[PDB]
Amino acid sequence: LKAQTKTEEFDAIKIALASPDMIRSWSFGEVKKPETINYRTFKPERDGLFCARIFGPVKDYECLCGKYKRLKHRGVICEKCGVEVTQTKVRRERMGHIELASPTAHIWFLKSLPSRIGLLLDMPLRDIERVLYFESYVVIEGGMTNLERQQILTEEQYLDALEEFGDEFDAKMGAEAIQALLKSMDLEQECEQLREELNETNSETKRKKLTKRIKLLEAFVQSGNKPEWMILTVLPVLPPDLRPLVPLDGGRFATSDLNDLYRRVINRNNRLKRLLDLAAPDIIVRNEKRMLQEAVDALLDNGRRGRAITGSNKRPLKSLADMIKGKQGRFRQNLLGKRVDYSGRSVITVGPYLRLHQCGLPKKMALELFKPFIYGKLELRGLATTIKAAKKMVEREEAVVWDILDEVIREHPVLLNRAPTLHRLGIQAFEPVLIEGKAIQLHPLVCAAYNADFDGDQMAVHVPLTLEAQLEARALMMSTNNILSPANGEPIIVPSQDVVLGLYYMTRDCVNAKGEGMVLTGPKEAERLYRSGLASLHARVKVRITEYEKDANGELVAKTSLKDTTVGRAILWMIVPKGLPYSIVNQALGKKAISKMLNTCYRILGLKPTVIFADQIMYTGFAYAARSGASVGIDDMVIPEKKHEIISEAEAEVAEIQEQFQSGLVTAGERYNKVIDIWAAANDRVSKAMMDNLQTETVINRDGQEEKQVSFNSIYMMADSGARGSAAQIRQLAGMRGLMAKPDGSIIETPITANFREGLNVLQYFISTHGARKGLADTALKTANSGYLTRRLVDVAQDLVVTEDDCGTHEGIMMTPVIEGGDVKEPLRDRVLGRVTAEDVLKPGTADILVPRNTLLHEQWCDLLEENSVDAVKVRSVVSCDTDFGVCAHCYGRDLARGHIINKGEAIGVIAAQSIGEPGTQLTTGGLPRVADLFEARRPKEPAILAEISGIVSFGKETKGKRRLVITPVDGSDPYEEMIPKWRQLNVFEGERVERGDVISDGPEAPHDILRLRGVHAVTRYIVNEVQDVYRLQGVKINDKHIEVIVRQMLRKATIVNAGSSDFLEGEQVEYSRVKIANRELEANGKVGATYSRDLLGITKASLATESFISAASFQETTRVLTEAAVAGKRDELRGLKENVIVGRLIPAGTGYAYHQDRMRRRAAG
Amino acid sequence: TDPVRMYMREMGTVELLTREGEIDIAKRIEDGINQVQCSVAEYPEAITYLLEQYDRVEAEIDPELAREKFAELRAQYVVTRDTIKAKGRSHATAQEEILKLSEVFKQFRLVPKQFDYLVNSMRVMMDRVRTQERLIMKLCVEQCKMPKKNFITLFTGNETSDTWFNAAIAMNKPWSEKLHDVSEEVHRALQKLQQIEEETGLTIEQVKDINRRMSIGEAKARRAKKEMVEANLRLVISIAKKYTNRGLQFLDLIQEGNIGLMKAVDKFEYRRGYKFSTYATWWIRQAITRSIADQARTIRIPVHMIETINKLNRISRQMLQEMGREPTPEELAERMLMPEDKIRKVLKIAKEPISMETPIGDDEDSHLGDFIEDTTLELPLDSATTESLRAATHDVLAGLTAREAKVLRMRFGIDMNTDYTLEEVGKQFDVTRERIRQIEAKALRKLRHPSRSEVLRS
Ligand SMILES: CCCC/C(C)=C/C=C(\C)C(=O)c1c(O)cc([C@H](C)CC/C=C/NC(=O)OC)oc1=O
Ligand SMILES: [Mg+2]
Ligand SMILES: [Zn+2]
């Protein structure tokens, strides 16, 4: 039964140090000349940094001398010119090597911060260099003599001390030393010593340093690597066709910088190699070596010294180092992110004949896009002899092909994506409708997801090729399945703006209208009553109608009624489907309510019949708009009748407060602060002036006297509807327009009292600038900042899939409605819908299991919950989820844009990360960074302290800059005494027992504590309840899960407290423990032990702890990761997401979930 | 901190000189020559080798004159061989013609190449001696458990014969009896040793000393010159401070300089009142300039090419002000020995030329080479068709006589390997040649119906 040898579905990646022999396993040869190409006959001279003799033929299947040019003589090597003939593709694969005159030192490990060559020698930085540039000799194995090994002498000393001990000690200088040094040390050794001293001395700086040192070490041993290797003797050179030497037009040339850089090492080396044979004076060759080690590090990570310039050009050259892709951090940096075939884009417009599952793509793009499918399909039906020609037909745009193409298209969706791809919806699959124009046409309803208007936004398109994709495209990405924001249960495919004006319009009622009070059979005769010119839309009318209600056993029950409604609202009811209450359209309908109508149709008749509703909800919503002829002309913007009146009234107050100020009844900061209120009040009144008047003054009259009703002025109906406007903005059209604050931040004690319908005067405008400018500026930034944020989250969620089914723990968190002092800042129902419980729920009274253990709370359930007065709930949430290395479905909850519980595999991490960082843009200590404060885990400036331990308190010693405070346990050993700076105000009661985690100073508190002290179900509520005050404040609906799930990553680490097998103090993944304690619990031995303590880790600091090193080395400092990762010879067993993408295999979630699983079992399988 | 200062500061140990320590050395050098010259003047096989090649270069600069001195030399040897073997004047006065001969050896120079050979040849031959010698000790001292105290007293006498071997076994000491287990080995090493006494034609005993006095003589001078150069670090810089930034970075020219320096010290002769420096300058300006031009641009380039350039570069800047405008290659070549395109061909290989990793816009910080399209690779719809070609064609050959098909396909490698000569295609099939030709043409006659391939054409 064979292993293998050849090539195979490998997995996982090993990185490590590089044996010289091993390196030589790589080179097809030693570059040894600094030449390039010929100079006249632009051939490549062998053998030198481009060659063929080594790297490969230039031209597919062709020897260099050229004796052998046939697709015949392949693996042959020209007798003359060291060339196997093969494709030229090798000279982009093959590598080289060079032998060095002097062993020479690897700049990554010598400086990539904690210098491996450093701490491994436990020998300081400054010296080694000192040894290297030949400043001073260093001891090595001095043996029983007079001196330590890693000790160092000056020349003279070395000489003095040479004369005393002839041999029997060793001292060198120059690379070889360190080379000498490493080869020679034995690790295994120090450790056991290091091991003891760890045990011999008990001190925190120490075991911090010590045990932390050792932990690095035996890692190295565990690697495989050899520290003699951190030094270079042979150097691999990257293949030529990647540091190419292309010709340009006008036959100037261009190449990558490595070639300069290369040419430098080669040069020095040789001349040096040369020098030896001249037996040149060691004063020079010393210098030479010193130069070589320059050229090298020039090569490798230019920037860690004097920074070799670019030749020719001022500017600095490009070191391998610099050419690492991903590269990033810290931080940035986007990744554009490869370009791509089958793709394109343009300007986009409306298209409202579009049924939500489609979009209008222009004949012309659609042509060039699907070109091959066309080439094939053409010759299949055999309208074309052969493709060559098939091309010519489409080249010719023959009429036939247009018809054809239609065929290729039929059920063939394409991808449509817009500007900054935020949440997964930034890409949505449509079926395409062929179209003239070079515009893309958009389904309006969708606009609102992408965020696209039509003032020039361009959306770009893609093609799903694979059979697969066409399903992926159709099942998941297809327009329709995305209509519940995965951010937050509500529909996202709500009635936008143009429309709800129409709807709102219809579902309205004028006091005394063309038909006030008749009665019609049903809407059928209702509309007929209209297009006939007989009724007004909104003339009140009773009508016969039927709603249905599927109240009974899954079953649809009908019901007729003489509902007392309007004509419009009648006519709408035509659109509504079955199991909906007429009650739903009875009223006026805001966009506020009308999305809510939509959700409901979905949570009761579900997808399809929610959808086709929504198109029809639109199609209509436009039509009565256009019919209504709403439009705005100056006359609509009513400046309240009494505006100017008050102004002068409050204009009074001020001359008053002035009088008093100069009479110094009252002060300046006083006065100011006084005045500015009254201006404030006025604006509230000149606000609520018009709004009181604008609102309703529609005073009209039926049969009798006068009645007044909610107006029909064109603009009210805008804001009233939710189409557009904000009474905040109105107030700027009619009444006074706010107050401007000058740049200071310091608001100006004289509001912009005029408005838009009136002139603005110079000065009015002017102050008005700075503002709108600052604003623009803000947005420009908040958006730069929103981003870098998300980049971090997804950086850290991500590798997180809904893996386990139901972890099966009873452990959950406790939900209360939010109640911020006054009124409930947010209901308990919103919080809890969609979660799955810990334990069965009892009524008010008891023995009454309402809901049983873990149930997924639907709407009904809730409604049941709300009927019973029910009021707080323990719930399953992913910080609870016992499942390790994933997230049980049950611990989670339900959401999707689809309604039912999460399905295994979905990538909830990302889709968490998304729904946060996305709306972040619109944020306003506080606001955005105040957010980063949550997740970054930053202590505030001045943090409270709390009852460290429960137990009675007492103050000991005195004021010595800090008062030691000694808590005293009723039972336990009392000794807790903390040293506190008393130059801040206390709170605690002085002879009082203090429940650990009480307020012992007041002011902000630092989460790590709350965690540590108060608890997880505690902290975990802090992070959210407080992230939540921000978004909530901003009308921004994000559901808690997501945050929790971030939080979860925050606390991936934990600190042990005892042992048996781990290493006593260490900081480790609650993961690996949760597994390892298990492996002792009934497993091997109790041994013992171990216990831990959970740690709060800042997101960013969380991320950079990825089992996957590829993953992580994309987020932070890179140069580091590799450097530090290659030394402990890590392996990356894949599994994570990105890493699989980089190396471009298949995603282990999504679809690819179903697949990977199928393999991981075969790994460790027999 | 920074390589350059180190070199400087390193050089800081001034160690300046006057005329005195100047010449004072030059002899110290020269001694080590003779001392070694003399040292080597001593070697029979150094000279008997001199004979063998002489016979090889003469069996294949005035030849007859060369034929003459070889006689004086050739004469003076054979006599001396008898002042040994005939043992007249027991290496006292027979010693003297041995000396006369060596004198003959001590005059005139040669070719440094055969030299380092002999130098080597001696010492490699010296190797085999301590080669065979390193054998006997591990086999008697460490092997026979025999003390090294007793090994140097008796072996040292001869170091070739077996006088100590069979005299350390009869001493009836406790370490003696062990010497037997190596009797096949000791016999074999003393053999090759005396053999060297035969190959060398000199006692292994006396052959060390001479080789050494070279070796030291070696040091004396080695040591010496080293000193000389260190004197003039400062020289090099000055001048090398000239050639700077010329498509070559500092330390480089200067290293090279200290080569050009270090060279000069060799070819010199202090017996020349010409003062040492200005003899350096040349040999320094030598390497550092000739250094530059051949290794400085990313494409090499011949010299004259360099010069023929700067001829232009200078002229054009000379030309410019003449015609305070602008110089056109016709004009420029005019002012020239030069043809013209020959010039134009010249222009193009200047320019160093630009780095692909140059920045261009910042449309998304682009890079140059982010834009160089490939030209090798084949288009997909371009490759695909090809695929249609083999097929649709293979689609056709089947419609023909299975005998003709294999006759075309042979002519065109198709589905096969090398394209078969439209002759030798016969020869394989016999019925040559013309015979087959007709068959060929029969194919082509079918293109009544090639609406397939016809179209795969354009
Ligand atoms: C050497 C150490 C770093 C390794 C990397 C990052 C190497 C990157 C190369 C070689 C690319 O050129 C490249 C790619 O290979 C792939 C991509 C895609 C845009 C993937 C980016 C997002 C990944 N996924 C993620 O975040 O989880 C959701 O964009 C690139 O620029
Ligand atoms: Mg826009
Ligand atoms: Zn060849």
Ligand SMILES: [Zn+2]
């Ligand atoms: Zn769970």
